Design a protein around this ligand. Structure first.
Ligand SMILES: Nc1nc2c(ncn2[C@@H]2O[C@H](COP(=O)(O)OP(=O)(O)OP(=O)(O)O)[C@@H](O)[C@H]2O)c(=O)[nH]1
Ligand SMILES: Nc1nc2c(ncn2[C@@H]2O[C@H](COP(=O)(O)OP(=O)(O)OP(=O)(O)O)[C@@H](O)[C@H]2O)c(=O)[nH]1
Ligand SMILES: Nc1nc2c(ncn2[C@@H]2O[C@H](COP(=O)(O)OP(=O)(O)O)[C@@H](O)[C@H]2O)c(=O)[nH]1
Ligand SMILES: Nc1nc2c(ncn2[C@@H]2O[C@H](COP(=O)(O)OP(=O)(O)O)[C@@H](O)[C@H]2O)c(=O)[nH]1
Ligand SMILES: [Mg+2]
Ligand SMILES: [Mg+2]
Lengths: 425, 426, 426, 425
């Protein structure tokens, strides 16, 4: 069981660059592809992400995609830049100009053939794979433009493999581009059918977590990409290391999704403590579970207290005990009996692994499927509402062949999605 | 006189791991299979200084079996006995029974036949599995269906783990634990039910252990199995055989769900202050605070019970201790059972495993009673399954894998009828 | 009692190379021919401390035989026993039979008569060759044609390598492997068919070898030839000779294609756990997973079969083990064969070659069944030949060398009748 | 089994100069004819290409032919120039001026006698030869004009020995001479009946392989001649070194040619890797097999995807395993069942040798006889039609004695070959 990696645009590449810095140190490899580890459990499942090479070297199964050559220049020269194979870097020369229309129809259609030739090469080399990881953002043009195109083309060829996309959805309070609502609405139109499991993150909330819980006075894009990676790495720790009770990517999908369209998730991580307040803290499971369910710690700008949890999960790492995980989970359900659906008994999925993150004793990851997402999509639909009334900025997109009908479907399908979550709330 | 044990899934393999460390200590056989008699019941001898078990390890995922392959007990197991897959059933019964079932079910059925060729007096099989996941439920249900046709009248025993009503670990558990009932009902000669949360209370109070993890619970099940088969492996005052045991215990063909309990379990330091004699260990077996499934016998009426003593026991008092119990109106028996005790006294004291959580004793007791108290452990579950099935939640996963929507009707209809039979006899 | 071996082509020499290293180990003879008895069956002694084999090496290309001339075993043979040509047949049977073969066929026949003069009790000749190239087929078919007329009634055995239906390395293979059918049919007393595919699966599964190359496959064939003739070279409880073995096996003059299999082949580490007894080894020979040709006996009815045990075997149980097999309806025999077994027990254990892929064992079995299932190994192939012959591809190469366009009529006609007989007797 | 060499024209000499530079280093021979090797297997068949001299020196079986003395001066003074015997350099004084009429009738007639006395002298020196190697181009006058005259005279004397031609056929996209189409068509008229098997190579494609796969920014005739040499060196490696399974020139000819006229081949070589991307590559047979069949690597300017393969070959070098070669060959046939002819099963020939190229662990050579050549001859034929229609440049050739009949059959006969390949497609 091994998984290939796809990154798109400036947003994804900056997120994806931190991933290979963190997971590489986890498996003990140097910056030049060499190995110098100690524990044998590192080599047991090294191949879930890497490919072997001559001379005892490893290279990752990553693809970096772009429509401008600037960002590849940064990642190539940066730390851990020589790990990647040169053939994997796929980039154009023109750019997107924050156009969803240019990315899908005009510019990306020429460059789409090149990448599928590469992902086909990585798909044959792997013996028995399960999923693809996609990293992108929903504001710009390249990430939402080609990111939508590959997903449709990837899905058709492989309708039996699981698909993962780790999306970043825009927020009004940190709004940055005049044409954001046009991009975000058009892309989610096809994520409602062409992906299996979807994560949503906000730059607004990642600012809420960074100042208050971390006591960060200078949150740059260095640290935010740090936080998303640790949630990204935690989900697939059952694959790379053993455990008392196991859960791979396929188990979670069946356990959380009651109906095919309700697969928009909310991350959360614990512990997250400041550099000075760590000495004054305990080391126990009950402190972890309270932090996980805290409405003050989620990674989306939506409060769960306006809705009820459908299903949740908890991924624990370290030497722990099975009852204590069991007793904490029942405490929350009984104390918070108002905030959980009634007609699904025992809504919590559990998993414990063995190897803790280096320098720590315990950890936890929360993936909780709630009905509070319906607000995070209505807010966007409102910003899109006042623009399409007067056809502002419409001429830029209409030049590449779209029509007023397509924008009509963009609102209608977004209308359908919010309706479904309200009905089951 | 030989038996074959089959471990299926993570739950079965983990329990089977605990047992085979227990058996080796009993017979003085080192992990590399060499002995520094009676061992033919589970072991096969190869030339000189080599014993290998009559066990087969089964899984659809390599993770929980390759832990054995590298561990301390790599040399004991014959390499062909460890069967692994490539993709797990992902907690789908439908994937276990239908899609991911047949590409592996054939290999083990070929491997069972090889093991059943060496034996001369095959007694029966022991099956270890759980009702939680589809890998241990969907596949194990398929194995028993193929075993029954090929072998027919030979007795098969299982040791199943029932999901708890409150302390449960998954979301879709009720869907699995209802679909296994048909193949257990129609294809099992004796079925043992054990609950996970109940073993926690026994660990908390009697053993005074703060945090029981899955290591210690699996050590407890090893003690129950070892005692039932201790009648074949050794010799004593009275003898009870597996086919003998079914005759006295099971009153009707549809009613084969005994409840198990053990005595004594005690900590090392508190073992000094008490004197453990036959008079009380027969009373400890009947405490509702020591039943291994969260059910109250006070709302049920006993139909039979078997008491297997081992160590230093004399038949002069056992009849007296059994006589004492009969005079209580709290412990109720049915009217059509003028006598309901089957007794077996053995000579070999139970052996304590080093690194364990139990103290060395001179005598031990294992109890196996067929009561109607267990009717509730199914009625509560059927509410959970029916409540979720009202909205057809999660069903889309199972429908696409080969099932149809009326299949869940038979799952509830069968449990509808089976609860009536216990009501009728009660 | 002496026997003479002839090797043809790259396939024959490579197979012959492995065997003649194997024989030297058996009789304690160093590569330089000196021994630090019974060896007269294969060896000739010259004065004092010099033994040379009864071998002859034949090829039309200097490359492969020169490897023997330089290798570690240069000193064993006469210089004159190693015969090489100048231009290979280039995978042309027509070149082999008519053009290039005739300039060398005389030289070896003069050499055969020289070796046949030394012997006093000649039983027959052993031929190792393959149906792939014309050099190994066209010359061999000519070479037996000369042997049969000159010597008449003495028995000749062949050990052929049949082309696989799927895993093959040439383009024009079917044309050769049909034209060889006539000469083998009417000029060979017994023909052994061995396939390149099946030996791979045997290496993969049973031996658990990751990358079997031609070194290991040739070592497997060396064991089969060593076992058949161990009845002559040693002494035992019961004896079966070549003339004796042909009598019991070949029921009609046209049905002489036994299928071979060997037991046991086991890896070193997996050998420790299993106790190899005669009861199971006689069962391993009948597994269709261990037949040396990609053929299913399940679609055929056995006609006869011969067992060649060696090591520590007593006749008390062999009849018991043979009796066990006869009770299976899976293993089917023809109605006019109430008895279909020839048994020979020898006293010498098989000897393991250092650097090989086998472990030292006390017992060994060789099976030789004349079954009717082998009809399919030709029926599939005749489709390949006939499909390509539809458009008359490649024929211009063969026509210019002296063959006629009608010559391919008899090639498919002869296989038409030969396949007809098996369904008739079956 | 030892073979003599013939070179014609400026193209052939520049191709042929590198072959003797490469093959000499393979056998350990120095630049002055001495020997300083280590492995004995070099000397086992050293005679396959060289002839013995007194004093422990070696000289090759080379014949250099020319019609202008400029090129002979360069090859004589170049690296490895003193290896050749001085008598072998045969060259005239007038030149051809890109006239196929002059190459056959006027200027080659006087000089043809001189060379045939030399090739006879090598034909008497040989003990038991098999073949002749001819290296030339189809664009100029000397190479086609003399080369077709050499082949015509050589064939009649030796009707049974095998004849090899490694031709360079022109391409429209790298067109360099105004009268190329007249030259190419008139020569191919007689390669149909006077040679045994022919290799076709395009200067257009060798640019594609150099820029793309090799990442070469400046492909000069120094590097293009490097590529072709490795193919000629690879075909006859079974003759010079041992192996598990062998294949000489006679085995390939019978295994490739279903009908006498379908003997035009396309080579291909693997691996070909840049100096930076080699560290990030595996070393296995399965990577080698896919590269050969890649339509982006085949060394002629025609797409095999436009047709179906008749037969193929594969000469492997290195210490390898025999089933691994066998298993991959069935993988390609099963996966690509659309692109192979149906009425000939198991269309692949195989050969494995032991001595690998110096400094490398593995190698492979691909020879594929396809039906896709029928297009590579139509493109040339079209260029000819627009010329002979209006009799442009015709007067230059008619002055030496050809007629409109000779040009008429030139298209008529080349019409037949396109007919055959389409018929069996
Ligand atoms: N006693 C015991 N119970 C376990 C253990 N592991 C899991 N369980 C129980 O098993 C239930 C979940 O289903 P499982 O038995 O784990 O299914 P599985 O073992 O994953 O089988 P597969 O899905 O095929 O891998 C939970 O309710 C646990 O109580 C164990 O190691 N020991
Ligand atoms: N067992 C075995 N089979 C071989 C070997 N080499 C080639 N073969 C088989 O031979 C077939 C090809 O025809 P060959 O027997 O090789 O023809 P040849 O050996 O070259 O004989 P000549 O053509 O006269 O040189 C292939 O299909 C292989 O199966 C070998 O070394 N061992
Ligand atoms: N989390 C995170 N978000 C980023 C980063 N850089 C840009 N973004 C977000 O990405 C959105 C715009 O996406 P964009 O960069 O235009 O995508 P692109 O056109 O494909 O490069 C903005 O709303 C930013 O908030 C980063 O380093 N980290
Ligand atoms: N591969 C290769 N082709 C060449 C070289 N030099 C010339 N050519 C090709 O040869 C063609 C002309 O043939 P030419 O050599 O001039 O014939 P000539 O009259 O004998 O010199 C042109 O189309 C060139 O592309 C070389 O060094 N290598
Ligand atoms: Mg599992
Ligand atoms: Mg040969």
């Amino acid at each position: 069981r091994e998984i290939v990696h796809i990154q798109a645009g400036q947003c994804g590449n900056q997120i994806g660059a931190k991933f290979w810095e963190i997971i590489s140190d986890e498996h003990g490899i140097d910056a030049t592809g060499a190995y110098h580890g100690d524990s044998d459990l590192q080599l047991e499942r090294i191949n879930v992400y890497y490919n072997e090479a001559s001379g005892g070297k490893y290279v990752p199964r990553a693809v970096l995609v772009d429509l401008e050559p600037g960002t590849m220049d940064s990642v190539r020269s940066g730390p851990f830049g020589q790990i990647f194979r040169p053939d994997n870097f796929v980039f154009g020369q023109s750019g997107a100009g924050n156009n969803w229309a240019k990315g899908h129809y005009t510019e990306g259609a020429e460059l789409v053939d090149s990448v599928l030739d590469v992902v086909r090469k990585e798909a044959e080399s792997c013996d028995c794979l399960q999923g693809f990881q996609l990293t992108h953002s929903l504001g710009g043009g390249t990430g939402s433009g080609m990111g939508t195109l590959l997903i449709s083309k990837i899905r058709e060829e492989y309708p039996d493999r699981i698909m993962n996309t780790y999306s970043v959805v825009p927020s009004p309070k940190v709004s940055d581009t005049v044409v954001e609502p046009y991009n975000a609405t058009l892309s989610v139109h096809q994520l409602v059918e062409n992906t299996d499991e979807t994560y949503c993150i906000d730059n607004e909330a990642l600012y809420d977590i960074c100042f208050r819980t971390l006591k960060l006075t200078t949150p740059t894009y260095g640290d935010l990409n740090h936080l998303v990676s640790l949630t990204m790495s935690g989900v697939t720790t059952c694959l790379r290391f053993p455990g008392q009770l196991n859960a791979d990517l396929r188990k979670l999908a069946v356990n959380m999704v009651p109906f095919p369209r309700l697969h928009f998730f909310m991350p959360g991580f614990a512990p997250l403590t400041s550099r000075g307040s760590q000495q004054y803290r305990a080391l126990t499971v009950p402190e972890l579970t309270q932090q996980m369910f805290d409405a003050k710690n989620m990674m989306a700008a939506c409060d769960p207290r306006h809705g009820r949890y459908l299903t949740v999960a908890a991924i624990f790492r370290g030497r722990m005990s099975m009852k204590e995980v069991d007793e904490q989970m029942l405490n929350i359900q009984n104390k918070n009996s108002s905030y959980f659906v009634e007609w699904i008994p025992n809504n919590v999925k559990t998993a414990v692994c063995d190897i803790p993150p280096r320098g720590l004793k315990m950890s936890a990851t929360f993936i909780g499927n709630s009905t509070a997402i319906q607000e995070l999509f209505k807010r966007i639909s409102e910003q899109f509402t006042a623009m399409f009334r007067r056809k502002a900025f419409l001429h830029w997109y209409t030049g590449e062949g779209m029509d007023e009908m397509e924008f009509t479907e963009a609102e209608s399908n977004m209308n359908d999605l919010v309706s479904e979550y309200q009905q089951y709330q | 006189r030989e038996c074959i044990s089959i471990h299926v899934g993570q739950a079965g393999v983990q329990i089977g791991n605990a047992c085979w460390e227990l058996y080796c200590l009993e017979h003085g056989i080192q992990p590399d299979g060499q002995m520094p008699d009676s061992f033919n019941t589970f072991f096969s001898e190869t030339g000189a200084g080599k014993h290998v078990p009559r066990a087969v390890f089964v899984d659809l995922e390599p993770t929980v079996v390759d832990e054995v392959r590298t561990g301390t007990y790599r040399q004991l197991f014959h390499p062909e006995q460890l069967i692994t897959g490539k993709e797990d059933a992902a907690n789908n019964y439908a994937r276990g029974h239908y899609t991911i079932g047949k590409e592996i079910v054939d290999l083990v059925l070929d491997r069972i036949r090889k093991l059943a060729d060496q034996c001369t007096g095959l007694q029966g099989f022991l099956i270890f599995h759980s009702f939680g996941g589809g890998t241990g439920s969907g596949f194990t249900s398929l194995l028993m269906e193929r075993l029954s046709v090929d072998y027919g009248k030979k007795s098969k025993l299982e040791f199943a783990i029932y999901p708890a009503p409150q302390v449960s670990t998954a979301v879709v558990e009720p869907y699995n634990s209802i679909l296994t009932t048909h193949t257990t009902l129609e294809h099992s000669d004796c079925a043992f039910m054990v609950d996970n949360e109940a073993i926690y209370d026994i660990c908390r109070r009697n053993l005074d252990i703060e945090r029981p993890t899955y290591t210690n619970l699996n050590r407890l099940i090893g003690q129950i199995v070892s005692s039932i088969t201790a009648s074949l492996r050794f010799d004593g005052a009275l003898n009870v055989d597996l086919t003998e045991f079914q005759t006295n215990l099971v009153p009707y063909p549809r009613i084969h769900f005994p409840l198990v309990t053990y005595a004594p379990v005690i900590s090392a330091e508190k073992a000094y202050h008490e004197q453990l004699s036959v008079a009380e260990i027969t009373n400890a077996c009947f405490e509702p605070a020591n039943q291994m499934v969260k059910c109250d016998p006070r709302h049920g009426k006993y139909m039979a019970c078997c008491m297997l003593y081992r160590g230093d026991v004399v038949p002069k008092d056992v009849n007296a201790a059994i006589a004492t119990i009969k005079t209580k109106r709290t412990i109720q028996f049915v009217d059509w059972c003028p006598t309901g005790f089957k007794v077996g006294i053995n000579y070999q004291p139970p052996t304590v495993v080093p690194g364990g959580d139990l103290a060395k004793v001179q005598r031990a007791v294992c109890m196996l009673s067929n009561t109607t108290a267990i009717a509730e452990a199914w009625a509560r579950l059927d509410h959970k399954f029916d409540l979720m099935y009202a909205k057809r939640a999660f069903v889309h996963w199972y429908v696409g894998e080969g099932m149809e929507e009326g299949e869940f009707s038979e799952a509830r209809e069968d449990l509808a009828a089976l609860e009536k039979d216990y009501e009728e006899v009660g």
